Amino acid sequence: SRLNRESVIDAALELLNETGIDGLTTRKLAQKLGIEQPTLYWHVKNKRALLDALAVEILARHHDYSLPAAGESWQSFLRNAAMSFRRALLRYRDGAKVHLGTRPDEKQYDTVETQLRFMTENGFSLRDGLYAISAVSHFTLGAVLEQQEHTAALTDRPAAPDENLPPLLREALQIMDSDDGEQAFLHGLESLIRGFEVQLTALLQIV
Amino acid sequence: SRLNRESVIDAALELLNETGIDGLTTRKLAQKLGIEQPTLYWHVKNKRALLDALAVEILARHHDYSLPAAGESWQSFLRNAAMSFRRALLRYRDGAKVHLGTRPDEKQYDTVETQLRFMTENGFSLRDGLYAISAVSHFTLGAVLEQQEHTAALLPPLLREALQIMDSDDGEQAFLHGLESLIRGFEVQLTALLQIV
Numbered sequence: 001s002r003l004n005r006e007s008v009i010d011a012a013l014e015l016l017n018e019t020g021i022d023g024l025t026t027r028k029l030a031q032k033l034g035i036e037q038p039t040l041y042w043h044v045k046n047k048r049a050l051l052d053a054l055a056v057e058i059l060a061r062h063h064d065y066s067l068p069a070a071g072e073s074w075q076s077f078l079r080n081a082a083m084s085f086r087r088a089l090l091r092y093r094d095g096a097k098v099h100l101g102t103r104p105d106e107k108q109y110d111t112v113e114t115q116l117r118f119m120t121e122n123g124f125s126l127r128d129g130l131y132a133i134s135a136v137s138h139f140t141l142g143a144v145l146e147q148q149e150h151t152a153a154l155t156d157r158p159a160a161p162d163e164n165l166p167p168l169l170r171e172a173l174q175i176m177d178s179d180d181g182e183q184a185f186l187h188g189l190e191s192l193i194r195g196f197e198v199q200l201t202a203l204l205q206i207v
Numbered sequence: 208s209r210l211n212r213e214s215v216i217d218a219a220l221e222l223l224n225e226t227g228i229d230g231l232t233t234r235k236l237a238q239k240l241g242i243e244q245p246t247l248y249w250h251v252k253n254k255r256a257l258l259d260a261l262a263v264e265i266l267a268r269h270h271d272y273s274l275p276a277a278g279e280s281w282q283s284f285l286r287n288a289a290m291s292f293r294r295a296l297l298r299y300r301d302g303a304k305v306h307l308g309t310r311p312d313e314k315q316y317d318t319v320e321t322q323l324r325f326m327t328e329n330g331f332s333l334r335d336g337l338y339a340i341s342a343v344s345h346f347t348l349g350a351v352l353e354q355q356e357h358t359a360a361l362l363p364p365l366l367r368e369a370l371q372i373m374d375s376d377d378g379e380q381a382f383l384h385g386l387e388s389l390i391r392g393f394e395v396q397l398t399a400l401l402q403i404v
């Protein structure tokens with residue numbers, strides 16, 4: 001079939017949902033596109049190049065709240081960006097692991113520049129602006145990776161017998177498995193934003 | 208060599224530092240222990256069983272702050288536990304990746320129960336206590352994973368100055384700053400009770 005960049009990325013993302021990141025190979029991608037391996041090689045050098053392109057493409061296509069709206073608060077921007085980032089990572093099987101090996105992308109640098117500009121215009125030092133954006137990224141990626149890797153582990157092993165669990169852990173596992181982590185994620189996200197605001201408003205005061 | 212659980216884990220952790228998690232295989236572990244693969248199989252069924260055990264044993268060996276001190280505040284306990292957890296994950300190559308997706312083991316049940324109970328004794332519902340602990344875990348894992356990926360790997364104006372600041376250390380500054388933000392947010396939520404906040 002067609003081997004323009006867009007068609008190859010489309011095929012590879014479909015293959016990722018079929019196999020997961022560990023099972024995704026250039027050999028399987030060639031099969032899916034109906035070509036020989038040295039044909040594919042002209043388009044796609046190796047698995048690493050393929051993953052770098054998927055990582056960038058997943059955010060380009062599906063992370064559509066990367067920029068603040070006109071007049072938006074920095075609180076609302078971090079909340080909206082975090083929810084978008086999390087949705088984008090959950091959209092594909094092992095998506096967060098695909099992201100975790102992104103390369104530098106010039107277009108992602110212009111976006112982070114706009115986000116750091118926005119934070120500093122709203123009163124953040126460059127340091128505190130970067131720390132806030134980083135913490136939101138770290139928290140969000142950590143929450144998604146724990147959801148996706150736990151799913152991936154239920155593919156291989158089981159989950160331990162319920163009847164030796166102490167009571168609060170039993171109830172905690174009931175709560176953490178009652179959704180895809182969304183309630184926990186949204187609650188932690190409010191805690192993180194409010195922490196940042198207490199720090200911003202403190203200026204040089206002991207806090 | 209010797210294939211008691213402890214010797215196998217010792218060998219697998221040494222191998223992890225050599226290869227990383229993707230490169231860690233039962234075949235390479237058999238080589239390191241000087242045995243054939245079907246000997247290893249008697250002791251270690253597969254990579255998933257090995258990774259599950261390493262996640263547990265890394266914390267048993269190196270996570271020294273899993274329980275509150277006598278009289279400690281929940282704020283100080285979360286801070287101390289998060290710093291310990293991060294140090295434990297940084298001790299081995301791809302340590303965070305080893306942890307991801309695991310759930311508490313039966314050997315950890317008493318510890319993690321005491322952590323949950325401790326939060327409830329300090330005014331949190333089990334749910335809100337779990338939400339706090341989970342946020343700390345997710346933030347710490349994310350921060351370590353980004354530091355371990357930068358190791359594995361190794362501009363606009365504000366970003367350039369930000370990269371100077373980020374790479375003047377390992378990640379510890381950004382980590383500890385975010386951790387204070389998360390703790391303070393949990394406190395603002397706890398102290399609000401049923402007030403709009």
Ligand SMILES: C[C@H]1c2cccc(O)c2C(=O)C2=C(O)[C@]3(O)C(=O)C(C(N)=O)=C(O)[C@@H](N(C)C)[C@@H]3[C@@H](O)[C@@H]21
Nearest residue numbers: 172173176266273288292309310311315319322340
């Ligand atoms: C309560 C645990 C839990 C409950 C429900 C689902 C889960 O996935 C977990 C965990 O995975 C926890 C950990 O891994 C700990 O790191 C964990 O296992 C642990 C420990 N063994 O001392 C910690 O220190 C905890 N943390 C870093 C402060 C944390 C546990 O609190 C949770």
Ligand SMILES: [Cl-]
Nearest residue numbers: 001002003004
């Ligand atoms: Cl073509």
Ligand SMILES: [Cl-]
Nearest residue numbers: 004005006007
């Ligand atoms: Cl194209």
Ligand SMILES: [Cl-]
Nearest residue numbers: 010013014061
């Ligand atoms: Cl689609």
Ligand SMILES: [Cl-]
Nearest residue numbers: 025026027047
């Ligand atoms: Cl491949």
Ligand SMILES: [Cl-]
Nearest residue numbers: 071072073076
């Ligand atoms: Cl707003």
Ligand SMILES: [Cl-]
Nearest residue numbers: 208209210211
């Ligand atoms: Cl032996």
Ligand SMILES: [Cl-]
Nearest residue numbers: 211212213214
């Ligand atoms: Cl032993």
Ligand SMILES: [Cl-]
Nearest residue numbers: 232233234254
């Ligand atoms: Cl293997």
Ligand SMILES: [Cl-]
Nearest residue numbers: 278279280283
């Ligand atoms: Cl204290």
Ligand SMILES: [Cl-]
Nearest residue numbers: 167168324327
């Ligand atoms: Cl109890």
Ligand SMILES: [Mg+2]
Nearest residue numbers: 309310311344
């Ligand atoms: Mg865990």
